[PDB]
């Protein structure tokens, strides 16, 4: 049973049958098979067309991931937390990190779930770390010079350096054991507690019309006000936000009504469980037939419609019911499962590209996956800096990467340990490129640790332009290593 | 026959005879044979002295090329164009590009005329591109910070990126066909038309004394005013400007007399045709004897002196004749042929150095030829920036490289196609250094394309210093590649 | 007799006996044997603990070297010079260079004294040159922007470039002859004379209480005023300064009493000769027994105590004796011998680390030895810049490296020539790393030579941040070369 890569060394007439036959070209989950798409669906003459279509689909999936994380995942998480009365400053610091890091976390979970894709996770986490500490942080200082806060900066840079070196040693050892994963998660909890304690010590020292409106994602006044490019982006997002509005309930403590849309919410009381059962483990559980007579989805629909009718007749259009926060729980779950589905598709596409072109998991992780997972960071942080909040954006840069690495490695490896019933996760490093990537991350961190205090925490355009030049040269070295020009 | 370079591996006593015998050490054109100079005329103990003398001669030739292009080629071209009503703004943008790019164009023509030297042309064009976009543009921003105009910058950077990638693909294919060369020239014409249209849409939205003076290149008042270094440079140029004044007529629409020097111009009516044929094809046609009795140069002299006498007796000292623009045509032709002769000498010297030291055409093209061809850019653009016109200088930087690459490749390859009666010009790339050079040019362009809009087009010293550091590291990598430290 | 690097490839039980037996693992001088410490005294499980202890001891030795040079060597040299009325401006320029460069000079002398350690000297001198011209000079411009003086800068950069290229050619030739060493020292004398002449041409154009106090190194008022880190450093230095106060006499022309401490000085009239005889050449001559009856140290003590009693009874507590400058001579000698002992220990430690880990002399010289020898430069120059004297600090940066290279190579090689009775010092370069280091130094110098005049000598944070990025990338390339990633 040959490897999947062998496909390109066969004759064109046996490619499609090889892909159909070889179990090493089959994916664990997902809905589309991109390799059968390339080698059976598409004429070989039109292979570059298939690949460009794949790239466009990948970019659109990154758009989906960003929108879902920004507008449906974090608001519901914030509703749940505000039900427990936190603080505005910790909220601002940390919820921005959760929102920016949901795609990285779910991509790492999906990649770690399979030994053939596990190198993608390391490539993407370290690659996003390099990109966010050079290009995004430097861009913030180029757009708006400011004076950084010294003590939070030193705290964040120290915690990040520790996490990075821990992962270096786990890579050298070649494995992640259960104790290591629990240690990663514990270190993240310790970091959040330290932030809390330090901040405290410093502080002391008609229904039809509302249905139509609720499902409309366009603000016509704002749309007319915007420029052409903003208009084009809005339309690029319209179908996605329509589906998200249809399926994901949202609870807003900021609004006086808490986004209580009676009929849309009662409809979602049917729709959301169905989407959950149809997207869980790729809907495998959906077609499971109970007792050989009734499938799971039918009984889900029955219970959902009964509960929807009961809620609709036991609630009022003006006043939300006393149990309106359970809707936040449900919307959090549905949004998480949507993000998981999109991440699964992205990982499958990247694996297919690696098979077709014989590219390593590390190089695909550190370029395409990292850039796609950092689009959201770039948008949110550059917007924050342009609005006059560059300290918050700069802090979010270093606070989100800590969450990415610690929670991504710890949770992804823990879930793989538990489901496989094994005792460890194998980290087989693929050549010299992983050590090149590690070296780049370390030296970027060293540059900032020396440079920022030397400027007395007054940051401007020179620091950012130096970081930009560094990232350019890093991509230089990566491409030279991937094509064999630099070999030990 | 034996390879020209095998000369060193011989005994000293057979070197001179080997060079005299081997047809692979002979040049197509020129007046001096530098290899016979090294191996026949000088003793083997004084080889480094010969090489230093060669380097000094090469620098002096670059001085000649710069002066001829600046003060005799462009003024006559401008006279011809102003005879047709050119605008002031397009004139300023584009005539500076022609003046800065004449040496690059003629060097590329000469190098493409021979398969042994064709790698020099690619090395010099890409190398000058890297040098002008880093060192010259950065130096402009270091000398005088300014706000760049966004739309012209984006237009220029886009056109340059397209031209560079087109040449990358022609290099990968390994040839330039006739259709490709015509496409290069057509794309340049399209670029000039686009500049015109965009600018328009934006705008709407005694005789003995005069002979003595005309042949004197010194301004005594200015000379006494200048410092020591400027004085030394003027003297370094005096013999060259004397010969240029003697042989090249100049027409100036700025002056009210249009530089009408009656007796000097009537003398030049004899001298200039003689220089043209004697430097045409390195003078081969000059000694062609018509009918076996009268050589070409004698009949040229006869016709020239008859025409000079007729013009002298049919014209007045105070009022130029009504045909004074034909003198601009003649001066344009004579200046072009002088530039061609100097470029031929430079290319022959570089080939001899490559034979003696076993250096590749790419490394000689990207260091010595590129620097020599960019001395004029540095002088003109830094002077413009120091006088308070940094926007014009910065625009000239990116507008001159487009002319260099498109017209140099297109015209040089087209002339070689037509002259050889072949169908294609073979581009045999010499190792890994050409791809190193391509990578440097591309990333430099990427750095500017990201950096300039991110600064909101406000350019200062930090951007320029980063570009300078980049160029230093590029020369690092080039020297490491040439000596084999990085390799496949 | 196997090369002592093969110690590791043996079984653990024969390591200690191998080290005890092999003469290639024995040092020329010093007091401790670090290899027997690693392989005989400690258990094989605690090797990393031994190495961390060695590193801490090495850092403490660098602290000792810095304190001795700053507070005991230079003050006595200044007393001797001020006895001859030297210029204050020249004093400020040049005495800072002697103080900053004493550790480099003595480390080079010790390393050149043995063929097994001679590569350390070249690595440390060039490495300190790279570090001081990038990190220290850039840090000065980041901490306090200023306008540099053009003529001193151009003079210094020219002299340094000449010295560096001279050493490149000596490395290519593979030796230092006696004429070369004398030429190095003569060129340094020429440089100092040139500085003098240029500056001139520009200018024209109870006893118990006093012993208790004299031996106390703490200033309680200042100590209480300082912060926590300064306090910790003070204690880190207390035992060292106690021993230095005990053994090294100091003469201060600034004080009106010239630091005349009658009883401490009379005690030092005994102590200092004893320390000299106990630390010269590791104490060999100390135990030499004259005539087989009386050792040298006993007769030294007898003469010292007689002379101390005579001086004590022939001098007054209030008025220093007429011969108070001989104490400056004695204190200069004692301080020099203390510095020599500390440098010997540092070199022996570095050789042991190279044996244990199979590291080259070049990489150990350019990282650990260079950083340790430049701690003093960083402290004094950054302190000078923060106090409002960045021109003096920036000048000291380029003036101290000239002293380091010229006097270190010239004097170290001359002393080795004379003592060995040979005619030359062999410079066997160790691989490609030495040429990597040479390339880094040259281009750094080129970057400054172009950049500083282009800014019109107005230096700010952008220039310094570029230099910092360069040094980071240099350490990149060094580590890649040491591990074989780049190679021939
Ligand atoms: Ca992200
Ligand atoms: Ca040019
Ligand atoms: Ca030093």
From Swiss-Prot, chains A, B, C:
- Biological function: Mitochondrial sodium/calcium antiporter that mediates sodium-dependent calcium efflux from mitochondrion, by mediating the exchange of 3 sodium ions per 1 calcium ion. Plays a central role in mitochondrial calcium homeostasis by mediating mitochondrial calcium extrusion: calcium efflux is essential for mitochondrial function and cell survival, notably in cardiomyocytes.
Catalytic activity, as annotated: Ca(2+)(in) + 3 Na(+)(out) = Ca(2+)(out) + 3 Na(+)(in); 3 Li(+)(out) + Ca(2+)(in) = 3 Li(+)(in) + Ca(2+)(out)
Q: Which GO terms describe its biological process?
A: calcium export from the mitochondrion; calcium ion transmembrane transport; glucose homeostasis; intracellular calcium ion homeostasis; mitochondrial calcium ion homeostasis; mitochondrial calcium ion transmembrane transport; regulation of cardiac muscle cell membrane potential; regulation of cytosolic calcium ion concentration
Write down the species: Rattus norvegicus
Name listed for the protein in its UniProt record: Mitochondrial sodium/calcium exchanger protein
Write out the annotated subcellular location.
Answer: Mitochondrion inner membrane
The yes or no answer to whether the keyword Ribosomal protein is present is no
How the protein sits in the membrane?
Multi-pass membrane protein
Top-rank taxon, per record: Eukaryota
What keywords are annotated for this sequence in UniProt? Antiport, Calcium, Calcium transport, Glycoprotein, Ion transport, Lithium, Membrane, Mitochondrion, Mitochondrion inner membrane, Phosphoprotein, Sensory transduction, Signal, Sodium, Sodium transport, Transmembrane, Transmembrane helix, Transport
């Amino acid at each position: 049973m040959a490897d999947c890569r062998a496909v390109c060394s066969l004759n064109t007439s046996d490619r499609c049958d090889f892909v159909k036959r070889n179990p090493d070209c089959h994916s664990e989950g997902g809905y589309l098979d991109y390799l059968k798409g390339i080698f059976c669906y598409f004429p070989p003459n039109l292979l570059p067309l298939a690949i460009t279509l794949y790239v466009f689909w990948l970019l659109y999936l990154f758009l989906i991931l960003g929108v879902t994380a920004a507008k449906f995942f974090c608001p519901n998480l914030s509703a749940i937390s505000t039900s427990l009365k936190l603080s505005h400053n910790v909220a601002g610091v940390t919820f921005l990190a959760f929102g920016n890091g949901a795609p990285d976390i779910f991509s790492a979970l999906v990649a770690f779930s399979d030994p053939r894709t596990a190198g993608l996770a390391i490539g993407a986490l370290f690659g996003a770390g390099v990109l966010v500490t050079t290009v995004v942080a430097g861009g913030i200082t180029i757009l708006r010079p400011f004076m950084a806060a010294s003590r939070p900066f030193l705290r964040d840079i120290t915690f990040y350096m520790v996490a990075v070196f821990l992962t270096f040693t786990a890579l050298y050892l070649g494995r992640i054991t259960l104790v290591w994963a629990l240690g990663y998660l514990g270190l993240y909890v310790f970091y959040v507690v330290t932030v809390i304690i330090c901040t405290w010590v410093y502080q002391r020292q008609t229904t039809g019309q509302i249905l139509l409106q609720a499902l409309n994602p366009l603000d016509y006044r704002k749309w007319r006000t915007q420029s052409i490019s903003c208009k084009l982006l809005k339309v690029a997002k319209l179908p996605v936000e329509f589906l998200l509005l249809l399926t994901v309930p949202v609870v807003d403590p900021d609004k006086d009504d808490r986004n209580w849309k009676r009929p849309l919410n009662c409809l979602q009381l049917v729709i959301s469980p169905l989407v959950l059962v149809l997207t869980l483990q790729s809907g495998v559980y959906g077609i499971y037939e109970i007792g050989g007579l009734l499938p799971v989805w039918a009984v889900v629909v029955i219970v959902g419609t009964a509960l929807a009718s009961v809620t609709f007749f036991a609630t009022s259009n003006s006043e939300p019911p006393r149990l309106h926060w359970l809707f936040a729980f449900l919307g959090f779950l549905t949004s998480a499962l949507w993000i998981n589905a999109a991440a699964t598709e992205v990982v499958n596409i990247l694996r297919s590209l690696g098979v077709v072109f014989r590219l390593s998991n590390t190089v695909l992780g550190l370029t395409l996956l990292a850039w796609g997972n950092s689009i959201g960071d770039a948008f949110s942080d550059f917007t924050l800096a342009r609005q006059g909040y560059p300290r918050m954006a700069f802090s979010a840069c270093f606070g989100g990467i800590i969450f990415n690495i610690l929670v991504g490695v710890g949770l992804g490896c823990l879930l793989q340990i538990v489901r496989s019933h094994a005792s460890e996760v194998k980290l087989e490093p693929d050549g010299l490129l992983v050590w090149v990537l590690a070296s780049a991350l370390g030296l970027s961190l060293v540059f900032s640790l020396v440079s920022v205090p030397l400027q007395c925490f007054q940051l401007s355009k020179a620091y950012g332009l130096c970081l930009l030049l560094f990232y350019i040269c890093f991509i230089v070295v990566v491409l030279l290593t991937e094509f064999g020009v630099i070999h030990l």
